[PDB]
Design a protein around this ligand. Structure first.
Ligand SMILES: *[C@@H]1O[C@H](CO)[C@@H](O[C@@H]2O[C@H](CO)[C@@H](O[C@@H]3O[C@H](CO[C@H]4O[C@H](CO)[C@@H](O)[C@H](O)[C@@H]4O[C@H]4O[C@H](CO)[C@@H](O)[C@H](O)[C@@H]4O)[C@@H](O)[C@H](O[C@H]4O[C@H](CO)[C@@H](O)[C@H](O)[C@@H]4O)[C@@H]3O)[C@H](O)[C@H]2NC(C)=O)[C@H](O)[C@H]1NC(C)=O
Ligand SMILES: *[C@@H]1O[C@H](CO)[C@@H](O[C@@H]2O[C@H](CO)[C@@H](O[C@@H]3O[C@H](CO[C@H]4O[C@H](CO)[C@@H](O)[C@H](O)[C@@H]4O)[C@@H](O)[C@H](O[C@H]4O[C@H](CO)[C@@H](O)[C@H](O)[C@@H]4O)[C@@H]3O)[C@H](O)[C@H]2NC(C)=O)[C@H](O)[C@H]1NC(C)=O
Ligand SMILES: *[C@@H]1O[C@H](CO[C@@H]2O[C@@H](C)[C@@H](O)[C@@H](O)[C@@H]2O)[C@@H](O[C@@H]2O[C@H](CO)[C@@H](O[C@@H]3O[C@H](CO)[C@@H](O)[C@H](O)[C@@H]3O)[C@H](O)[C@H]2NC(C)=O)[C@H](O)[C@H]1NC(C)=O
Ligand code: CPS
Ligand code: CPS
Ligand code: CPS
Ligand code: CPS
Ligand SMILES: *[C@@H]1O[C@H](CO)[C@@H](O[C@@H]2O[C@H](CO)[C@@H](O[C@@H]3O[C@H](CO)[C@@H](O)[C@H](O)[C@@H]3O)[C@H](O)[C@H]2NC(C)=O)[C@H](O)[C@H]1NC(C)=O
Ligand SMILES: *[C@@H]1O[C@H](CO[C@@H]2O[C@@H](C)[C@@H](O)[C@@H](O)[C@@H]2O)[C@@H](O[C@@H]2O[C@H](CO)[C@@H](O)[C@H](O)[C@H]2NC(C)=O)[C@H](O)[C@H]1NC(C)=O
Lengths: 173, 217, 216
């Protein structure tokens, strides 16, 4: 019945282009670090015992289910990490956002190539267009803010569209 | 030469059609700005002549498009004379979102002026239908390429959406050629046989018009 | 326009009616453009959807004037297989690119309606008394894949002799294309019979269709 351990990503994006970098960290409800951390990848026990696990030049093999647990029985809710290789990737701070919390969308161009005329779509509607790339920053989540999103943009003068992404928002009576 | 697409925002400036210029005798050029992004303030479109002589009042519409963008069109009335006499008009758009200003200009096309040659034809019936016959009109060896085709029928200038006219194409004779097609109904040729395929070009005399009659049977 | 580079584009042409029924040796072509001097290969790979093997292909790499670099590859195709809806795909890959470039093509679908052709001929004009223009209208057909041409005394004129437009739709669910063939006096005295043939997937019985013409 106690507080379970949480996992944070930095940068937020749990979906990234191959060769990109990301870091997993296990909760601050273990501050001075009283217990070694144990990371689990798709199942096996990782050999890193520290509070934060790194990932470099992320290969595809690195995609998967990540979980960390301390010295209790319960283990962090799993965090899924997908590694892609396309022209545009739509990254989100969190796929399921508790009511009220902030949300971030980002149209990310491969090798961080410039993407002009980026447009973000929400349920087939044009949410926001800008001459250049830009992040979608939703300060306070809502109900309308759910639905499936995806972005389009020009990279080196050609047109591209990110594979679509679902975002859900909850309520607490 | 590419300081013409500020922040990516492109613009187009259309030239008066032969028709709107000689028949209708009320020509107008249009400046169309695309890929603008919604904002608090509107753009600042400004029309001007190279001669320095003042300009008529313009029109302006701002249509938020489906793709999140925002368009702006502005049409301007133009003195039929001034234009043919080589005058030159320029469209200058300007908005905060923009670094350099956006400009585009246009004037009467140059070169040698060779009148149009037109020949009208008509198809024979076919086992498929006995009450539908097709018309065709070929206009060639002309220049510039700016041409306005159309049709008449018993003093009635048919609906533009009635015929299909192609785009100019060059010939081994330094002139261009365009084709027109106008499907027809039995009822209409019994009303009369005279079908006219007019043509408006900057050359052709004496009324800048040129036509060739046709008919079945 | 200037500095801003443009990325690789790929296209894939379909067998012309002609090269498919007359010449009976059809070939599709994959054309890659806007490539740039790379240190790596640029793999082009042909494949069928049926899984059945493919003939050997051709390949040319022409450095273009605008600093770019083009690659074309033509592939021989079984006349039968094609008409029977087979499907071919061109896969190009460039080291410095995310996903691979692919394009495919197969026999156009829909209802097959034969072509209707009518040939015409202009009357002289004060400008010249030894030059007369021909025109040939082919309509109400579908698919839009059509091969126009001309004959003259058993001589299939040079493709560069006539100008044929691109298909356009009609309020009759079919398409229509126009052809123009300027002519010289010498030739009609040699004979009057001018033929404007047409090759379509429909028309019977030899998949050909023509209409004679002549002045006077
Ligand atoms: C968001 O959506 C926007 C629209 O919803 C979209 O804007 C469009 O941008 C394109 C270019 O990116 C614009 O194209 C230009 O169109 C001009 C004129 O538009 C049409 O109508 C004119 C008369 O009103 C005609 O004179 C033109 O011919 C054109 O009409 C064509 O279509 C009709 C219908 O079948 C046909 O009868 C005509 O024969 C025409 O084919 C043109 O003047 C411009 O021409 C220039 O470019 C062409 C080829 O690129 C050259 O050959 C010319 O010489 C010249 O340089 C050009 O075509 C289009 O107008 C915009 N749509 C709108 C608002 O009408 C925008 O791109 C979208 N943005 C994003 C990021 O998604
Ligand atoms: C935890 O569980 C996950 C999922 O079960 C595992 O991750 C999978 O890892 C494999 C690699 O072993 C991933 O597969 C790879 O996908 C790449 C991307 O696919 C895109 O591109 C292709 C081609 O255009 C499209 O068809 C496809 O739809 C996608 O758009 C491919 O490029 C890879 O291809 C290469 O490897 C494969 C297999 O080795 C060969 O068949 C190919 O010839 C080529 O050499 C490859 O297919 C897979 O996507 C991952 N799944 C997920 C959900 O991400 C983790 O590995 C696992 N944890 C561990 C380590 O056990
Ligand atoms: C993801 O992170 C890696 C690694 O991070 C960086 O390198 C490590 C070794 C540590 O020092 C980290 O603190 C540091 O942030 C990035 O890869 C690294 O990229 C750099 C260039 O961006 C490489 O440097 C080059 O090294 C070669 C040969 O070693 C030289 O010839 C070059 O002149 C240049 O110095 C660095 O070697 C490489 N790390 C290794 C050894 O793999 C990676 O770029 C990053 N992903 C991104 C782009 O975000
Ligand atoms: C494009 C950007 C600058 C951004 C910019 O100028 N931004 C405003 C105007 C126009 N846009 C680019 C937005 C239009 C996009 C059209 S779109 O249709 O996509 O909207 C500039 C900044 C530095 C430039 C590079 C280096 O020099 C090296 C090298 C020189 C070669 O010689 C050409 C290749 C290369 C890699 C250069 C490419 C590109 O040149 C760069 C990235
Ligand atoms: C001009 C010089 C060579 C001399 C060559 C060397 C590597 C080339 C770039 C990369 O290939 C990546 C990318 C591939 C796209 O397809 C088109 C855009 C881009 C940025 C290419 C542009 C340009 O072409 C380059 C800078
Ligand atoms: C042609 C131009 C120079 C002019 C040079 C400048 C940097 C070079 C690239 C990078 O080195 C990375 C990579 C190493 C591989 O080994 C081969 C592929 C690749 C993409 C190289 C290709 C090519 O060689 C480059 C674009
Ligand atoms: C595809 C290959 C790596 C494999 C990588 C290796 C070095 C990369 C280039 C440089 O970074 C310079 C420049 C930075 C701009 O921002 C975008 C354009 C440009 C030319 C980059 C393009 C492309 O990304 C390159 C060729
Ligand atoms: C640099 O020069 C080359 C050659 O002029 C340019 O390539 C040309 O690219 C266009 C498309 O942008 C090709 O047009 C297409 O051709 C296919 C083939 O028939 C057709 O199916 C399409 O409808 C379209 O017309 C064109 O064919 C191609 N030229 C060649 C090699 O045939 C290239 O674009 C230039 N680079 C720049 C600055 O864009
Ligand atoms: C991505 O989302 C779409 C849409 O989800 C719907 O809208 C949400 C707000 C929520 O109400 C969901 O319960 C809705 O389903 C999903 O689309 C469904 O895809 C499945 C295939 O798995 C199909 O059987 C359903 O008919 C689709 N529903 C509709 C009406 O489009 C989609 O599945 C999601 N991505 C995944 C996980 O596949």
């Amino acid at each position: 019945v106690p507080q379970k351990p949480k996992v944070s990503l930095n940068p937020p994006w749990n979906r990234i282009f191959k060769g990109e970098n990301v870091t997993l960290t296990c909760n601050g409800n273990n501050f001075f670090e009283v217990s070694s951390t144990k990371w689990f990848h798709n199942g096996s026990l990782s050999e890193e015992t520290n509070s934060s696990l790194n990932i470099v030049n992320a290969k595809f093999e690195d995609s998967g289910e990540y979980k960390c647990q301390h010295q209790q029985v319960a283990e962090s809710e799993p965090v899924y990490l997908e590694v892609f290789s396309d022209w545009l990737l739509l990254q989100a701070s969190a796929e399921v956002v508790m009511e009220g919390q902030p949300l971030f969308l980002r149209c990310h161009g491969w090798r961080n190539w410039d993407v002009y005329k980026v447009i973000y779509y929400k349920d087939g509607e044009a949410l926001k267009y800008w001459y250049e790339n830009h992040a979608i920053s939703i300060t306070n989540a809502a109900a309308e803010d759910s639905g499936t999103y995806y972005c389009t943009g020009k990279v080196w003068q050609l047109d591209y569209e990110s594979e679509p992404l679902n975002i859900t928002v909850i309520k607490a009576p | 030469p590419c300081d013409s697409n500020p922040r990516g925002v492109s613009a187009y400036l259309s030239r008066p059609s032969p028709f709107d210029l000689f028949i209708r005798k009320s020509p107008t050029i249009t400046c169309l700005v695309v890929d603008l992004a919604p904002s608090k303030g509107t753009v600042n479109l400004t029309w001007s002549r190279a001669s320095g002589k003042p300009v008529n009042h313009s029109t302006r519409k701002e249509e938020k498009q489906r793709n999140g963008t925002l368009t702006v069109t502005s049409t301007l009335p133009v003195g039929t004379r001034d234009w043919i006499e080589g005058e030159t008009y320029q469209c200058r758009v300007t908005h905060p979102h923009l670094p350099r200003a956006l400009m585009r200009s246009t004037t009467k096309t140059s070169g040698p002026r060779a009148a149009p040659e037109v020949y009208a034809f008509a198809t024979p019936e076919w086992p498929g239908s006995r009450d539908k016959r097709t018309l065709a009109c070929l206009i060639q060896n002309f220049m510039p390429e700016d041409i306005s085709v159309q049709w008449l029928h018993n003093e009635v200038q048919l609906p533009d959406a009635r015929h299909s006219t192609t785009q100019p194409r060059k010939t081994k004779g330094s002139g261009f050629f365009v084709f027109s097609r106008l499907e027809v109904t039995r009822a209409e040729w019994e009303q009369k046989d005279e079908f006219i395929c007019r043509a408006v070009h900057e050359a052709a005399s004496p009324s800048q018009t040129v036509q060739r009659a046709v008919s079945v049977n």
